[PDB]
Design a protein around this nucleic acid. Structure first.
Length: 19
RNA sequence: GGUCUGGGCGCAGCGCAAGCUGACGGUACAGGCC
């Protein structure tokens, strides 16, 4: 389970796709 | 005044046998230079 790249500053760009 | 990186940590859902994910925490958190 749970293993891609949730890397903080990179995840930011995906977090900013939920919005 | 300004830029770039990104990691280890915890709760829930279903089985003949095994194994996913969570606008879940986290819009958080750490690090160095200029």
């Amino acid at each position: 389970r749970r293993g891609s790249r949730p890397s903080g500053a990179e995840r930011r760009r995906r977090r900013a796709a939920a919005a």
